[PDB]
Design a protein around this ligand. Structure first.
Ligand code: HEM
Lengths: 499, 499, 499, 499
């Protein structure tokens, strides 16, 4: 017949079988003897307020929509697991790395960035690769992307950036002037901009790309010794990226390409997978590191920082109900069990606040009470109560104040943070010029070869060319700073475009 | 050693054997090492966004409150069950009345009307007596008051009325001028105003009061024969009211007098109960009734239409967590299973809409998904999906349109609403003059005794006194029309208060 | 220099030549010193909760999104005026037709139906054409589409219909099975299902299509004399539509082609306009009409019910802030001022409820207080108070109960709805068999030509081909019921599809 | 006639006289013909969905309530101005203090702490005194209290503290086992607990108590020099407290005693006023100072740190509409104009988040857009956009990303916050031991006389007399740790109650 995805309803009805159709009830459970004709006074008379089957049903349809994610709105999710294949415990004590073989159920959602709920997957844009570990020490949310770096290092420029990447406030259209006037004013973006306008800007499906945590993190062992790290989960399906024409086609032929590709892969048992590594780095080294170690616009070279294998990431279960399981999924970077802590990364720091904050608005104050979000492999005990849409028992009638004297939830000297030291005037430090060329330069010449460079510039040229001459100048100028050739090369194409 | 109530945390810590701790965790489930001292820079430095322990808890704290019931904000709840003791199947084919012995679990909520969440129980106001019958056909909400009548008979004046019974738009104080200027212009209230300022005006606890569905409903047997009815559930603890004096004392001595009573009663195994009856009135009779059988400001004389016993209401368990189980409840008059239907009672007609409406707002669209409100003894299946805070599995990946060729839920033609015939134009018919005195008089000089007759006139004059003069007259005028010795009695009383 | 839409920011900066930039402030107005670098404890230290500039901005960014329209999500809007050009004061006493030359401000929003916010503009799909008239008697929203009919005729099927027209509950992809299973089973759609798949399914922008009320409405004059009617507003720019070819190209080349088109036309002064006509069926004729006169899947042949000019609709003003002025925009079919009323059209009926309903959710309880939604050309005086995000003065300290003796607002007896008569039993009268082929046949034969019939069956087959065989069978069957030739062309052309 | 409050409507009519009342309309401005009788088919017939007048008004009524503040729900409000009478220019460069005689609009809401919206005004509970200053540098919210200290000095303890003061998790009643349990295990509260149970526990209205910025703040002049200060606003009407029985009866007599008292004062011309003072402490001194200068349970003595005069606070205007103006009022300690800055206070720091956070919950993302909260004497311009119920034009078509090259809002280097250098390990420094008795001892003995002292004990015992003996013991122990006779005295009383 057709793909497993397209055969959704069929398979469902068969798995049903002789079973008789459940009785069609109202939201309240009352049966409905006829849900196709409205209660009216006469066969051509008014609809009666009395028809509560209608109002019950209808009224729910009127509220079916919740706000889409402010970014990474378009995406698909799957459920699988994480299996430990190595002992990394000598660095981090996270009970999720306790011992080789220990499997931890995971949830994942891939996505793009700019486009809204109804956009196409096969477009150039970073890619969301969020992983949720339902550990026994609560939930670990590794909110990564398919890139190890980002366009900026100060959370303060995120809202502004995303704006420049979406629609003009008045026309509602995509604005090249917004996109570029911005990037041009913030060279610190050059690194990721490059990586973006390259063959990695449009990966062929989610199964054919890598996942990165970007931010520098922190691991704490048993003795309480800490280290900075980088999470890397390389794909076992091999890197496969799409072409401008192939994506441009798939944009209209099948805007949900990734979604369908992913569903089908797992639906046929062809489970995609990823290996997970890390990059350990001592505070002493971080002291020596040539760049800001917690600067999101940079990477920790493999040469000096080899990747240590941790375990495996398998996806083998497709969502049953997409809304209740994927749409509602919510990953909060602040969710790190004892053993994994954040790092002084300005960018990351801001995220600690943003995810639960927005979740409280997209899903609701009690979003953690949603199944897909609930840490079902841990016992939630604390002194928080009420809040709209409170499921479960609300910790019944246990003591809500802390401390107390009636045997209620307690501390955890073992689950204490790792104390590091910091000195310096508590102020706003201008991190504007922490070098926006070095790593971009190497990328451009070492990692890229001549044909890839050829593409990079045409890709940039085809978009940049729509911005205003002045922005273009400012833009090209920045590329030259990474390399005279980068500039002139793109410059060349532009003048052409301006036909 | 105090009452059961006061010894809440007590009995809790006790029954905790013999078992430690659960570990204090965040919402995510990550254990909290120390949650008594904010993570700060230096012993006298600022706060770190990095203290997600803090942010996480504070955040939740900032959202515990939700809008209180528009009306009937203050109250107590309890659970138990209902059981059949009489066969009325020759009247209604509802599964809740199946055969004698049939035990249907229930949830009940008592409350006041005008006062807010802070107000006290022990004051002059009607009382909210709502029953939630969790049946196999869905939930059946019997939303009723401590009286069989109300002040008005057209939903269009309820909001206006409920406004008059609350604070001044400007001062935020209770305003007698509002109350009585409204009552005066609408004599239909006479009947209920009288029942309000009568000894019944303030019961002693929720246990010593009666219950009523107030409105006229519809019953239909498995044979399709329908007949108008009126529910009645009298207390088995005997009717017991509270002197104006006591009420006021209790008012401030224990604003929550209603709660603890009801609570302890059950705690000390002394479970409350009421005797459910029904008044049956064929359509024929209804066509003959000297009054509108659907007028909320009227009663069915017991002599002409006696009470048939049908069952017992037993509240034998107290809520474990008030919020989750009582404040979060949801009673929907529209929730009537097969065998039970509404009547053209203009007020009821309005409640068919307003209740689910507000619930969606106070609690949220998926409020029927809240445990307390979910019909757990029915298989809720249909074509409704999503909505904010969507719990459950959202009915999985089942066909979502009706009709469908994939074995999704079918309709049960055995629950189709009863087919009645109405003839006449669609218009706004004035019920303002549907006799607002007759039944009132027969209640004054007939139901009440000279003794309690004077108490009434006193109670009324004490409030009416605070109203403007032009307000006081019109008011009396009405009473005068119920019986001269009624208005004159009050008037006289007024002039005295009037100095 | 490019199209006016592109230079949006240019002409802006250009717009305020003079004028010096405003000061960057927080939400509270507090002036911002440095908005680019967060306040960390040291150049490489953590983030301080003490940084309010951050939090303020971030917390807001995090809540920018609201639920998109449950249907007709992706749209475009404009403002202009409506002028009366003919006297139809004998049919309706509506103040908006009050006299030749009279101009009434209007707001308009065009749209697709199924696609979400990211979706492409140029796709086969009906098109929405909502007009809000800010008249003296309050607002009058005429919520029309680009077709005079619809797919169903009973609101209870609508939620289902849409569900089918959207993503699969599990895969989240578009399911043709769903689409055609629904249509195949509900033959009342044939009519619209045909129009839709005809060249009219993909209009060339919004400026090249007619607008219709679709529903039969009731007009009422000064003598209380009522008549039924149909609203039509034909484009003055000429009917123009895109070919499946260009339409599919534009889909990826310019997903917002409709937006960009409407903006530019206005931006350059080339204002689009439509002439509004109306048909008039007298209560008598409605009775002898060959079909049900309130059946949305039918039409009043120009032949027996000639169109009558009324005035002109002109759009000469682009939105300044899309979100605020278009996205937040809301239309309620229930918003009809004196002299204009509904018919018993089952579909129109449900609509009277659903729009104000959703708005109360998508926008919020007081959504009528949002600028674009406020009937600023009328004085809202009533007994409504409070609700979240309540602006203006909340009607100040005015009496909040009706009636009252304090001069608060009074009703207007000349706005009382025209009273009609209906008789019969109050029940769910089945309408699934009200002739779903006659008018459909006239379309396939008299309104189209061979060249066209060829494209239609080609367009139907293109999509339908993806539905299980048993489903196609069912569909072809229904087509044959309209005309043998019809089902064949599709069937044959289908057989070609199945290799 | 009676007082101004009682004659509210009476006056509204009079002044509003010589004017025909407004036409009653729907939310959409459509005039309603009859708003007293619903629309039904026939006199005793069902209600029609057709009746949108009904649904409109009802739907809005069903949504009047919003969540009440989590703390300080019961309060009263008013508006006035602030007048600088003295020059502290050398301390703060805050425009509010610019010159002598400089008037600035203000808003004020007084409140209790634990009691909900329906609770009574006169009870032992602190008092809220929030002053909203609408200055040119944005609004400055001085969220004070009627006391200078607080029960605790760490944020994490607050949500827990507040719980002990509110209802029980299950029985939902006020619980002394929690009240005292928390206070027992937490001896730092000793200072405020003594102050609370003192004569100052129940002020005779709001006009007879003082105001205290409570926390320690930082002031910055034009030359970047900072200093730590305390805000004081002494009552001009003099300190007048209510008796324990006077207040206890007034409780049920007049639950809105504070509300009325204030409304009338202003209403008759007797405007209440307060004098604003500032205590100043230099960093040097802040060094020698001998407990934590930021500890909230500690106060600066006028002795070594004298009270400097700053200006006047006068309230000469009542709210016209309570909901819109007082209920919707939102004060954010985080709102601080240039010249005013937080201080290391853990407590305060924590308040910097809760307030805006909870507001976005209780009121909505755009709460600052509600009139009374809007910083109208300032010019809001930034890069924040959209959000639900977005009022205004949303800043129109202005560029929305910063930095940009199109002349959008620029920043002010002048408003750059004062930089304070901090050193020390980053961890959760225990503050449970910072003297929880010294200052307190100086009250019971020095500040308090024999008389008051007698009741302080009596007041405490009277309450604590309901907690498990094992709790009482602890309580007394901490009191004696304050001073032998303190606990001893209490303990004595305790026994008599123990019966
Ligand atoms: C008879 C069944 C119908 C019902 C119950 C119904 C219901 C709805 C609902 C609940 C909304 C949603 C969006 C929002 O305001 O956020 C909506 C939007 C829309 N409907 Fe349908 N509708 C019906 C038929 C149609 C027809 C047949 C046309 C035209 C007369 C139409 C045109 C529109 C348009 C243009 C929008 C979105 C417009 C805007 O706010 O600018 N609808 N409808």
């Amino acid at each position: 017949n057709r793909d497993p995805a397209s055969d959704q309803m069929k398979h469902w009805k068969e798995q049903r079988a002789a079973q008789k159709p459940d009785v069609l009830t109202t939201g309240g459970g009352n049966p409905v003897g006829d849900k196709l004709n409205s209660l009216t006074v006469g066969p051509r008379g008014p609809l009666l307020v009395q028809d509560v089957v209608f109002t019950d049903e209808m009224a729910h349809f009127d509220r079916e929509r919740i706000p889409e994610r402010v970014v990474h709105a378009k995406g698909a999710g799957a459920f699988g697991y994480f299996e430990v294949t190595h002992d990394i415990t000598r660095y981090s004590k996270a009970k999720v790395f306790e011992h080789i073989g220990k499997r931890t159920p995971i949830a994942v959602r891939f996505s793009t960035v700019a486009g809204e709920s109804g956009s196409a997957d096969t477009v150039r844009d970073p890619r969301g690769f969020a992983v949720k570990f339902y550990t026994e020490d609560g939930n670990w949310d590794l909110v990564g992307n398919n890139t190890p770096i980002f366009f900026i290092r100060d959370a303060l420029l995120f809202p502004s950036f995303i704006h420049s990447q979406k629609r003009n406030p008045q026309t509602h259209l995509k604005d090249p002037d917004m996109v570029w006037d911005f990037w041009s004013l913030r060279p610190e973006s050059l690194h990721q901009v490059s990586f973006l306008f390259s063959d990695r800007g449009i990966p062929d499906g989610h199964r054919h790309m890598d996942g990165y945590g970007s931010h520098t993190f922190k691991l704490v062992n048993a003795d309480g010794e800490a280290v900075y790290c980088k999470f890397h989960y390389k794909t076992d399906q091999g890197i496969k990226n799409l072409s401008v024409e192939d994506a441009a086609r798939l944009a209209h032929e099948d805007p949900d390409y990734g979604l369908r590709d992913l569903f089908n892969a797992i639906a046929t048992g062809n489970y995609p997978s990823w290996t997970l590594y890390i990059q350990v780095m001592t505070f002493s080294e971080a002291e020596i590191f040539p760049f800001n170690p917690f600067d999101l616009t940079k990477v920790w070279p493999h040469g000096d920082y080899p990747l240590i294998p941790v375990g495996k990431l398998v996806l083998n279960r497709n969502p049953v109900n997409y809304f209740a399981e994927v749409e509602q999924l919510a990953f909060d970077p602040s969710n790190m069990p004892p053993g994994i802590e954040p790092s002084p990364d300005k960018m990351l720091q801001g995220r600690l606040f943003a995810y639960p904050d927005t979740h409280r608005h997209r899903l609701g104050p009690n979003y953690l009470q949603i199944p897909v979000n609930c840490p079902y492999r841990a016992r939630v005990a604390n002194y928080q109560r009420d809040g709209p849409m409170c499921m479960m028992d609300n910790q019944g009638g246990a003591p809500n104040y802390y401390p107390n004297s009636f045997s209620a939830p307690e501390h955890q000297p073992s689950a204490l943070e790792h104390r590091t030291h910091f000195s310096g005037d508590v102020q706003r430090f201008n991190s504007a010029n922490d070098d926006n060329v070095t790593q971009v330069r190497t990328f451009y010449l070492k990692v890229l070869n001549e044909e890839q460079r050829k593409r990079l510039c045409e890709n940039i040229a085809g978009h940049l060319k729509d911005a205003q001459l002045f922005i273009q100048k400012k833009a090209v100028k920045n590329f030259s700073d990474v390399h005279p050739e980068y500039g002139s090369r793109i410059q060349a194409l532009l003048d052409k475009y301006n036909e």
